[PDB]
Short mmCIF file of C-alpha atoms and ligand atoms in Angstrom, two decimals:
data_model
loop_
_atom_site.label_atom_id
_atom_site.label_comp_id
_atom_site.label_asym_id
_atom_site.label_seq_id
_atom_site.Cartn_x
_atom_site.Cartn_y
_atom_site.Cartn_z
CA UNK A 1 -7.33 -48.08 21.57
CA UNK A 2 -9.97 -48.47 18.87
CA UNK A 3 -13.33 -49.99 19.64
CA UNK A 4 -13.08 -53.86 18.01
CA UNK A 5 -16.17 -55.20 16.15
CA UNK A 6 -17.56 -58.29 17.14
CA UNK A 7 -17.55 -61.04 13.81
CA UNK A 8 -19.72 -63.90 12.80
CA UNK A 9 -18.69 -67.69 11.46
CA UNK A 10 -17.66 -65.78 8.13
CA UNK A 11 -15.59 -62.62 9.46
CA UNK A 12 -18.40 -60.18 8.85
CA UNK A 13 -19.19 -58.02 12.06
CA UNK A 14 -22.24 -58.13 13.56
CA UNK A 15 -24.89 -56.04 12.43
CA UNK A 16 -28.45 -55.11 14.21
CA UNK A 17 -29.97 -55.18 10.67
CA UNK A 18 -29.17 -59.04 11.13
CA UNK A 19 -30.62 -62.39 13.19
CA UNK A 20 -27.99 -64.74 14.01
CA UNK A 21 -27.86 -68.06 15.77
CA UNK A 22 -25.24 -67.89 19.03
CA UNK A 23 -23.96 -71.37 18.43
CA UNK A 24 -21.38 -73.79 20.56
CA UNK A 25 -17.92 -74.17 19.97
CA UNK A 26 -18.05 -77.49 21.33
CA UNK A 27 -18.90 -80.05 18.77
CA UNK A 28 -21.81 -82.96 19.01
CA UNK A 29 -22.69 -83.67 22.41
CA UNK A 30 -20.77 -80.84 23.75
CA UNK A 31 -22.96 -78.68 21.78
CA UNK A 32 -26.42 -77.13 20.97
CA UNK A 33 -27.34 -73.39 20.12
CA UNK A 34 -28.84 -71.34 22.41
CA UNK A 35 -32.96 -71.25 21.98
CA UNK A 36 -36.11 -69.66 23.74
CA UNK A 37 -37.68 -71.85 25.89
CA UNK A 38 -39.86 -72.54 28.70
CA UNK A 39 -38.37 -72.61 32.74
CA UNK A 40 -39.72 -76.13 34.07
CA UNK A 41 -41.13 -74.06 36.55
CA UNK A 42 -42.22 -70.88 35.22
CA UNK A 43 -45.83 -69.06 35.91
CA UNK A 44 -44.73 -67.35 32.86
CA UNK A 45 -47.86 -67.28 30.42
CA UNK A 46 -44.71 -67.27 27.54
CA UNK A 47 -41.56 -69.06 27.17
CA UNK A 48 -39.08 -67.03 29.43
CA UNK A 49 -35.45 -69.13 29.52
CA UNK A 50 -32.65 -69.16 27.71
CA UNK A 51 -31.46 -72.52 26.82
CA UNK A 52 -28.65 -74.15 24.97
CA UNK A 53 -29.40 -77.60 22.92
CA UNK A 54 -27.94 -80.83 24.36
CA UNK A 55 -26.53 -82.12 21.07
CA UNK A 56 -25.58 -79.93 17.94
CA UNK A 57 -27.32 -82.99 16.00
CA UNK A 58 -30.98 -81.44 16.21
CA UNK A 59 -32.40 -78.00 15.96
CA UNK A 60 -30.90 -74.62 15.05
CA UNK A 61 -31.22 -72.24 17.40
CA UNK A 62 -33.75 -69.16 18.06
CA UNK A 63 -32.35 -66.29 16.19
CA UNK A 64 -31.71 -63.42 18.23
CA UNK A 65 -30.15 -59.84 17.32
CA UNK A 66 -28.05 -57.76 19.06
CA UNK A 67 -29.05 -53.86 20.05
CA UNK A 68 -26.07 -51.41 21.09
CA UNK A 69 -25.99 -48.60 23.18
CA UNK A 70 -23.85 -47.28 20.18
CA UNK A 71 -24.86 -47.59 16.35
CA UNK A 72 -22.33 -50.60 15.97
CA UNK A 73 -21.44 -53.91 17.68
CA UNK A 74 -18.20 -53.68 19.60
CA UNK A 75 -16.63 -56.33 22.13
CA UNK A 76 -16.96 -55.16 25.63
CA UNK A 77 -19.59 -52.62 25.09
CA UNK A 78 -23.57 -52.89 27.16
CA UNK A 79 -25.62 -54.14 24.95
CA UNK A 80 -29.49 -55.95 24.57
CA UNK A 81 -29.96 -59.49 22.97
CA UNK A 82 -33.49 -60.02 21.96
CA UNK A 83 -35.13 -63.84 19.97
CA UNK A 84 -35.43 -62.69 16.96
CA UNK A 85 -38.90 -64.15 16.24
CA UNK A 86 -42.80 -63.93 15.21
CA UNK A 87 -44.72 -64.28 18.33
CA UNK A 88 -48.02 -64.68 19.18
CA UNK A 89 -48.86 -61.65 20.85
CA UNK A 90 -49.42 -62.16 24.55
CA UNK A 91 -45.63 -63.19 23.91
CA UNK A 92 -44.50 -60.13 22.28
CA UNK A 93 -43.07 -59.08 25.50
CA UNK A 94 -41.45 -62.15 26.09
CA UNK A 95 -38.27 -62.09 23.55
CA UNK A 96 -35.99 -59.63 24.97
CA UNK A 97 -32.95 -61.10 27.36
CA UNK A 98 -33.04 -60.30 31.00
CA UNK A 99 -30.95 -61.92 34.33
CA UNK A 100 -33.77 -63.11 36.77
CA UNK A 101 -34.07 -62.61 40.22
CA UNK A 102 -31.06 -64.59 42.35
CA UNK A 103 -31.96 -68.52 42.45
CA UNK A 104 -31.40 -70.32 45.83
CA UNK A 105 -30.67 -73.18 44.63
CA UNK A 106 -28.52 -72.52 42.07
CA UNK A 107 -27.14 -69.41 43.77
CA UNK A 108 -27.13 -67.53 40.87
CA UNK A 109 -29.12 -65.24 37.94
CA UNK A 110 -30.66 -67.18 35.11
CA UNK A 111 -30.77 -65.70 31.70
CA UNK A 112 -34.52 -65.21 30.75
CA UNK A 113 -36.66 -63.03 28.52
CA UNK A 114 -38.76 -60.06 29.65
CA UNK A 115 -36.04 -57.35 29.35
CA UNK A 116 -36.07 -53.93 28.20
CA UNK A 117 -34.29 -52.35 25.33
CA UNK A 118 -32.80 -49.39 26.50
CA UNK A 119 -33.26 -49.13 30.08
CA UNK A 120 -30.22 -49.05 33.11
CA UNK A 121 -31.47 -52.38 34.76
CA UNK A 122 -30.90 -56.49 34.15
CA UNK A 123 -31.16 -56.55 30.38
CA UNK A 124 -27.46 -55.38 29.31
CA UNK A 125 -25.45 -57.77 28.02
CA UNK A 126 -21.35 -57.81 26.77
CA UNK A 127 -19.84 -60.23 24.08
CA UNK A 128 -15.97 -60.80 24.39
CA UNK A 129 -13.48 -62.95 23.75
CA UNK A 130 -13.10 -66.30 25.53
CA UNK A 131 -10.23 -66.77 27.30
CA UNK A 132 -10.18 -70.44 25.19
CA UNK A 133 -12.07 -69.90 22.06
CA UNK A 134 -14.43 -67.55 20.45
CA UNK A 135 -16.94 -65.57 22.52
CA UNK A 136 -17.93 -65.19 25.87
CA UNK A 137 -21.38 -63.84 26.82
CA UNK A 138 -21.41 -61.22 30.27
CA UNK A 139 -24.03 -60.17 32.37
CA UNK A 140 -23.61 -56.75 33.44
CA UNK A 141 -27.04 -57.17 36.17
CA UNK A 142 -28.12 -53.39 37.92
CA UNK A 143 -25.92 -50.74 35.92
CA UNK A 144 -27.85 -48.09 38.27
CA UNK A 145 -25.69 -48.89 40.95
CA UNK A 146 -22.51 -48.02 41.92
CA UNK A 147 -20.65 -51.42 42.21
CA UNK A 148 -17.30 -50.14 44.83
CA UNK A 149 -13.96 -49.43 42.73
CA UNK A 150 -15.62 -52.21 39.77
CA UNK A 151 -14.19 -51.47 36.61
CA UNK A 152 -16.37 -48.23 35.58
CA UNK A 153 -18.53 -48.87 39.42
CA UNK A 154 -19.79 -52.08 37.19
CA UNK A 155 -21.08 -55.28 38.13
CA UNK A 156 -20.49 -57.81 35.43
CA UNK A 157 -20.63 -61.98 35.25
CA UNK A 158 -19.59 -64.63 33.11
CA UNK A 159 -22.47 -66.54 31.40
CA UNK A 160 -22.44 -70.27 31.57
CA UNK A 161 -24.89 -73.20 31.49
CA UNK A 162 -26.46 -75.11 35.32
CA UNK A 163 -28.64 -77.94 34.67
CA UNK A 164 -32.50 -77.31 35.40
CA UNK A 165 -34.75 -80.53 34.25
CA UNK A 166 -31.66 -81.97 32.82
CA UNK A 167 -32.13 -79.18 30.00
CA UNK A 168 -28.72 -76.70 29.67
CA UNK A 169 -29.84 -73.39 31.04
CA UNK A 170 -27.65 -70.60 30.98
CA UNK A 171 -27.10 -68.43 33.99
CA UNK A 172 -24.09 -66.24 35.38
CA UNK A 173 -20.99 -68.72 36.38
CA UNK A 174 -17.91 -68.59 37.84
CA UNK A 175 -16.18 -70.94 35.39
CA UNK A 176 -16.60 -72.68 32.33
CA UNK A 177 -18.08 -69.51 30.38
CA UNK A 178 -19.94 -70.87 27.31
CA UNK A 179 -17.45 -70.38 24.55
CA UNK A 180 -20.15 -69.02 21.40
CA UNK A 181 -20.08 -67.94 17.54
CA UNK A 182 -22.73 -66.03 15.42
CA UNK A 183 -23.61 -67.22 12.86
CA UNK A 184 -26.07 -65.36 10.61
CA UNK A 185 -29.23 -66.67 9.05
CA UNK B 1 -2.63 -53.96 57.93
CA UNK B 2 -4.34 -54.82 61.13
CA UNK B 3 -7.74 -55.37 61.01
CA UNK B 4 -9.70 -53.00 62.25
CA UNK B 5 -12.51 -53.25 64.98
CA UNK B 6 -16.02 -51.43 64.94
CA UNK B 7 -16.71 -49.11 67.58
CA UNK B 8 -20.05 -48.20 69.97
CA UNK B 9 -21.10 -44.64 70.96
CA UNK B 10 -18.73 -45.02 73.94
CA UNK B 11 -15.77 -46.49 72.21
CA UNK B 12 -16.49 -49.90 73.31
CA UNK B 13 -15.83 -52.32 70.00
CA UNK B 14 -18.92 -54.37 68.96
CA UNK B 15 -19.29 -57.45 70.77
CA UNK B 16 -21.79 -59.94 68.94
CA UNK B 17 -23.05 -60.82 72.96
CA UNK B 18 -24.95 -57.44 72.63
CA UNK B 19 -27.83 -55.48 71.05
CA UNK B 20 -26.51 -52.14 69.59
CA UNK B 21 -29.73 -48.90 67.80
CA UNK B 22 -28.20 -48.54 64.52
CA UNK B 23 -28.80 -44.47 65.28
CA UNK B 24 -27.90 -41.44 62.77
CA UNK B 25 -25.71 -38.72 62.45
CA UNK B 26 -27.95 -36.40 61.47
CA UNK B 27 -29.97 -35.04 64.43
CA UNK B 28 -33.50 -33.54 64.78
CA UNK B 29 -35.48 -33.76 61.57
CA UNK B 30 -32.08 -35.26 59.85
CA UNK B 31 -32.39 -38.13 62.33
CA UNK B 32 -34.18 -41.34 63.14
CA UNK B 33 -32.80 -45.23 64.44
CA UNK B 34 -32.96 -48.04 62.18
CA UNK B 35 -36.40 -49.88 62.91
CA UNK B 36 -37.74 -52.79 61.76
CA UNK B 37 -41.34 -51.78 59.63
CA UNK B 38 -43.65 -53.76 57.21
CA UNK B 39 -43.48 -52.53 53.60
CA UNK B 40 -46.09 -51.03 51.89
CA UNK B 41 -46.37 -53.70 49.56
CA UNK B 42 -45.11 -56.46 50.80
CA UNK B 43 -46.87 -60.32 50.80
CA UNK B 44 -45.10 -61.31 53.33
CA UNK B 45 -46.68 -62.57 56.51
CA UNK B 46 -44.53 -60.51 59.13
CA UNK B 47 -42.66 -57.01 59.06
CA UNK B 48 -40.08 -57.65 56.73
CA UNK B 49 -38.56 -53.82 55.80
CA UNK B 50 -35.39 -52.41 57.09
CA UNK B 51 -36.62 -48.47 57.43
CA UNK B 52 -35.23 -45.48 59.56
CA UNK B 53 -37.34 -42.99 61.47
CA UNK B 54 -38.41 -39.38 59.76
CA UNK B 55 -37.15 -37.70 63.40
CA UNK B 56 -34.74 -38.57 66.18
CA UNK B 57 -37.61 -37.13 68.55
CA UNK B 58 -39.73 -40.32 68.13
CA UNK B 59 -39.10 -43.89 69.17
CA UNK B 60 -35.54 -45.77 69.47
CA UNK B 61 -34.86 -48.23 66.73
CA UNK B 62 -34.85 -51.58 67.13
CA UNK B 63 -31.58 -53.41 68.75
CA UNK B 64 -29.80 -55.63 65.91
CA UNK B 65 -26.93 -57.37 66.38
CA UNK B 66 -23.81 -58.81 64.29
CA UNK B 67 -22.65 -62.04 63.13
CA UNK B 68 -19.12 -62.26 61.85
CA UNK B 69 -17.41 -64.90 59.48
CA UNK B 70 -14.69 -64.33 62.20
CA UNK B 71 -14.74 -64.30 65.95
CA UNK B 72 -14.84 -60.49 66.38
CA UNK B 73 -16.19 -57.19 64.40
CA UNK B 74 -14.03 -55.48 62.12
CA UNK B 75 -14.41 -52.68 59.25
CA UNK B 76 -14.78 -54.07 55.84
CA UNK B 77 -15.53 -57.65 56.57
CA UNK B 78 -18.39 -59.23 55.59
CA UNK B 79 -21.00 -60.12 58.64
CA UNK B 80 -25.20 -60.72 59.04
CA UNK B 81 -27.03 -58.01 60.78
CA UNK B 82 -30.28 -59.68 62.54
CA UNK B 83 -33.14 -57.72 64.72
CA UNK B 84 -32.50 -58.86 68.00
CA UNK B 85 -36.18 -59.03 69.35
CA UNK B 86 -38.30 -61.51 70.52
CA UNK B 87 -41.15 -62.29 68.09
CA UNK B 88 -44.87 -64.06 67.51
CA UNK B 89 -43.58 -66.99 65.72
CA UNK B 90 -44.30 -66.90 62.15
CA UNK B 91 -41.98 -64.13 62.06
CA UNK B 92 -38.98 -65.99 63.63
CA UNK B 93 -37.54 -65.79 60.70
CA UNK B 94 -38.16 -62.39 59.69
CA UNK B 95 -35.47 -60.44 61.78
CA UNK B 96 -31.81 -61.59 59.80
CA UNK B 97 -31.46 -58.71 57.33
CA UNK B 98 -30.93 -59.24 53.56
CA UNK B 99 -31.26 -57.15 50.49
CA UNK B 100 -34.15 -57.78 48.30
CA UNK B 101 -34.72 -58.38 44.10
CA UNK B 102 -34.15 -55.55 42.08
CA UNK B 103 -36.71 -52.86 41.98
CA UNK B 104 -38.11 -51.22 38.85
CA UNK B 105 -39.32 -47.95 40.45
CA UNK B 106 -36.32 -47.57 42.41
CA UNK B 107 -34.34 -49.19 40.32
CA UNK B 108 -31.98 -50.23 43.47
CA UNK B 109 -32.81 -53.35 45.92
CA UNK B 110 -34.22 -52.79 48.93
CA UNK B 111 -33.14 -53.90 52.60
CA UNK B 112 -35.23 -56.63 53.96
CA UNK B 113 -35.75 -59.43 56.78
CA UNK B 114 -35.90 -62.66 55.78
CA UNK B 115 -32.06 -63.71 55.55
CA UNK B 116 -29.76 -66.30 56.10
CA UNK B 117 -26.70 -66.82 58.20
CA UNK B 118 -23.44 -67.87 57.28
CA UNK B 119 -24.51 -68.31 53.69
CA UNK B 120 -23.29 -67.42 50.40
CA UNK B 121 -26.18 -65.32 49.10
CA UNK B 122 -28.18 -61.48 50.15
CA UNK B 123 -27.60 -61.30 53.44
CA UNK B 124 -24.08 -60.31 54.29
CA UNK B 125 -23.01 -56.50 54.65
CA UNK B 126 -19.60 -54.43 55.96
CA UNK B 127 -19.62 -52.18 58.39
CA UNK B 128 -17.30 -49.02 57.05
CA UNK B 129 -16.12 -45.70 57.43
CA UNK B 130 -17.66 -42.97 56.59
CA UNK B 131 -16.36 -40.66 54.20
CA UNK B 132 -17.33 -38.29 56.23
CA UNK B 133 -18.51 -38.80 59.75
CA UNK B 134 -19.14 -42.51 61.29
CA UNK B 135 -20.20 -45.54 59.70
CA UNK B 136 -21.70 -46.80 56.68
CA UNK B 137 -23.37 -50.17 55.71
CA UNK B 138 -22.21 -51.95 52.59
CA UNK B 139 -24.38 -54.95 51.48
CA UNK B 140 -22.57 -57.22 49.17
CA UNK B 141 -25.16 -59.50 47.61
CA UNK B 142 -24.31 -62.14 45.07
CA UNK B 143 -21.10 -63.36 46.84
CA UNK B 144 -21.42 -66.74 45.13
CA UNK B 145 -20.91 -65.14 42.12
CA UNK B 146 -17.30 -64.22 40.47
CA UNK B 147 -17.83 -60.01 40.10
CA UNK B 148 -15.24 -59.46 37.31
CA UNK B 149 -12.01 -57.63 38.28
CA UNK B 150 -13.96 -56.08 41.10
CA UNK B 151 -12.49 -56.00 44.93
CA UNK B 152 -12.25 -59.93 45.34
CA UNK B 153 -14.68 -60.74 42.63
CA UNK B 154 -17.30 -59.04 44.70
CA UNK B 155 -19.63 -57.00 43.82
CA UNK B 156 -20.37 -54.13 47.26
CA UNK B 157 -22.39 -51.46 46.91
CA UNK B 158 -23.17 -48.38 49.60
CA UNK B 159 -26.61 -48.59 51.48
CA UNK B 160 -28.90 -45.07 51.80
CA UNK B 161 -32.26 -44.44 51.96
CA UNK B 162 -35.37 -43.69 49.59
CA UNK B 163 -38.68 -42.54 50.07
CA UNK B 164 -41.00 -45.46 50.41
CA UNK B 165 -44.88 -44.04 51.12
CA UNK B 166 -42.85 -41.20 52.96
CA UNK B 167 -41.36 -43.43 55.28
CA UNK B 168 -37.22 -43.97 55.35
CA UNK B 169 -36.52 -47.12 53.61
CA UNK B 170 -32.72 -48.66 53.08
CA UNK B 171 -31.25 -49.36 49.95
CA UNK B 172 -28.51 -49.55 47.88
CA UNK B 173 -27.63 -46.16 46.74
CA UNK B 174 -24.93 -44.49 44.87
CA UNK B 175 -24.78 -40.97 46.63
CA UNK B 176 -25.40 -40.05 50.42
CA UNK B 177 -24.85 -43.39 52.21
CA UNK B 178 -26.24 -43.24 55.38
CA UNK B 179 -23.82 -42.28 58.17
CA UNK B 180 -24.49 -44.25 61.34
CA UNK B 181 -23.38 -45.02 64.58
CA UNK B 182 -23.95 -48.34 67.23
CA UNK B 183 -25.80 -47.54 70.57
CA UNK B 184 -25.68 -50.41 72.88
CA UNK B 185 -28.66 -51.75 75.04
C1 NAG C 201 -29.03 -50.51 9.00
O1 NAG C 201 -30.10 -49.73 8.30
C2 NAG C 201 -29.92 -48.25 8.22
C3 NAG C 201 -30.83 -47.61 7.21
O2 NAG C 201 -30.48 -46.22 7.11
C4 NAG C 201 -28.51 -47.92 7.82
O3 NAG C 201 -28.27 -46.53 8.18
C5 NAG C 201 -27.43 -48.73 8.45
O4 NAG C 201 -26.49 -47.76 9.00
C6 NAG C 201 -27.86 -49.69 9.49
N1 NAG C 201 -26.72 -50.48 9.86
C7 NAG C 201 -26.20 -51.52 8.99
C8 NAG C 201 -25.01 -52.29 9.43
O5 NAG C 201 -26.72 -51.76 7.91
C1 NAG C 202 -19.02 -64.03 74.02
O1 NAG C 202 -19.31 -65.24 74.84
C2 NAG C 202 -18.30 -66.34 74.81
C3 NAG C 202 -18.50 -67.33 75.92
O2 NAG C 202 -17.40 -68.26 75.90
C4 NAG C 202 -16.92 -65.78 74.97
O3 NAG C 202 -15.99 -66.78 74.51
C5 NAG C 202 -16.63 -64.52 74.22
O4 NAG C 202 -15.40 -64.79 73.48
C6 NAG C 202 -17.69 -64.03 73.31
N1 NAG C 202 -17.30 -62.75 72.80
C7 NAG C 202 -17.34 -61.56 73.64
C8 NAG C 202 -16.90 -60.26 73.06
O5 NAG C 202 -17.73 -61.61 74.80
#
C-alpha cells in the first residue's frame, strides 16, 4: 500500500523546497488562514500561537513549510511545520510548530511555536484527509513514549480551533477538525 | 468479564477507607516504598515529587490512598492516588498525585502532587497487572482529549522510574514498569 503524497490547491504535492499558506475550506466568515501570532497571554518575548483568521476577507496567511522524517511529503507520516518567515532574530527560535503544555481551561494542547526539527518530542505533526473535505492537521504530542496498544504505541489528536480573546486558536479537539488546503506562494 | 478487584499484601481488596505503602518487588538494594519528596528543581512551595526509596532497609513510604470513578477498586479502571498525610497547610493541596509537563531531559513526564479529583485532566492512573510479578501504575493523562484509535480514545502509558539527582523518581516509561504491591496501615 504505497505511501500517498499530500497535494496543494493545484494538484502538485507538497514539496519542502516550497512555503505554502494552510488555508480554510470554509468560505468568508467561516474562514481565515492559519498565521503566527501572539497568545493574549504569553511571557513569550516572540509571537508563539498558531492562529486561524476570522474572515477569509483580510490577510493571507503566514507561510509555513513542511519538513519530513522522509525526503517527501506523504499523508499520515510525522512530520515538522515551521512559519516560513524573516524574523528578527531574538525570534528566530520562535517559527517552528510545537503542542504546549496541557491548558486547564481549555483542557487541551495549543498549537504554538518553539519546536524542534528533528527531535522525538511535541513538534511532530500528520496531514490527512478529512473525514468531510480536504485535510486534517494531527498532533502526534510525546512520540518517546509508549502510548498502550495505540496504533504504532502512538499518541495522536485531531487539530481544531477554541476561542482565546475571541481570536481562533488552534489546539488538539475532539471534533470539528479544521478541514485545510495548501496553497503555495 | 467481571471486573476485577485490587488486592493488599494479605489478599484483602483495596478499600478507599484505608492507607495502603505503595512497596516494591524488588527487595534489598532493588527495593524502596513510594514516598512523597521535593524535586530538585521544583518552584513549588511544598514537596511536590512522587519518588521511591534507593533501599527497602530505610524508611516506609508514605500511605496513599485511592479514589475510584466507581464505588470499589478494580484493575484497569481509572482512579486518583492522593498521600494520605496530614500536612502544614500550604501544602494541602500538594498530596493528590498527577503527572507533570513533558520533560526535555527525560523526555517523559514526571509524577507529581498537585492534582485534582474527579476531573478530566493529569491526575487519574490504573492500577494493573504486572507482566510479571504484582502491580503496575498506568497514568492516563489527557483524558479530555480523543487519543485516535487508541483503547477508548485514551492515551495510557506504563509508569517506572528515572534517576533524578540519584534519587528514584516516577515517570512514564516504556520498559521496566515498576512492579508494586499495597501494604495497608
Ligand atoms: C529540493 O532540492 C534538492 C537539491 O538537490 C533536490 O535534490 C530535490 O530532491 C529537493 N526536493 C524537491 C521536491 O525539489
Ligand atoms: C466505606 O465507608 C462507608 C460508610 O457508609 C461504607 O458505605 C463503605 O461502603 C465504604 N467502603 C468500604 C470498603 O468500607
Amino acid at each position: 500500500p504505497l505511501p500517498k503524497p499530500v497535494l496543494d490547491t493545484n494538484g502538485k504535492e507538497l514539496n519542502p523546497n516550497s512555503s505554502y499558506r494552510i488555508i480554510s475550506i470554509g468560505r468568508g466568515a467561516l474562514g481565515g488562514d492559519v498565521y503566527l501570532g501572539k497568545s493574549p497571554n504569553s511571557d513569550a518575548p516572540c509571537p508563539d500561537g498558531v492562529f486561524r483568521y476570522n474572515s477569509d476577507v483580510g490577510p493571507s496567511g503566514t507561510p509555513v513549510r513542511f519538513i519530513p522524517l522522509s525526503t517527501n511529503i506523504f499523508e499520515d507520516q510525522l512530520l515538522n511545520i515551521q512559519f516560513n518567515i524573516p524574523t528578527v532574530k531574538l525570534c528566530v527560535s520562535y517559527t517552528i510548530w510545537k503542542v504546549g503544555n496541557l491548558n486547564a481551561y481549555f483542557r487541551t494542547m495549543l498549537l504554538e511555536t518553539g519546536g524542534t526539527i528533528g527531535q522525538a518530542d511535541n513538534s511532530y505533526f500528520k496531514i490527512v484527509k478529512s473525514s468531510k473535505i480536504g485535510y486534517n492537521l494531527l498532533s502526534c504530542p510525546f512520540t518517546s513514549i509508549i502510548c498502550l496498544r495505540c496504533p504504532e504505541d502512538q499518541f495522536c489528536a485531531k487539530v481544531g480551533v477554541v476561542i482565546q480573546n475571541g481570536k481562533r486558536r488552534l489546539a488538539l479537539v475532539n471534533e470539528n477538525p479544521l478541514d485545510v488546503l495548501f496553497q503555495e506562494v
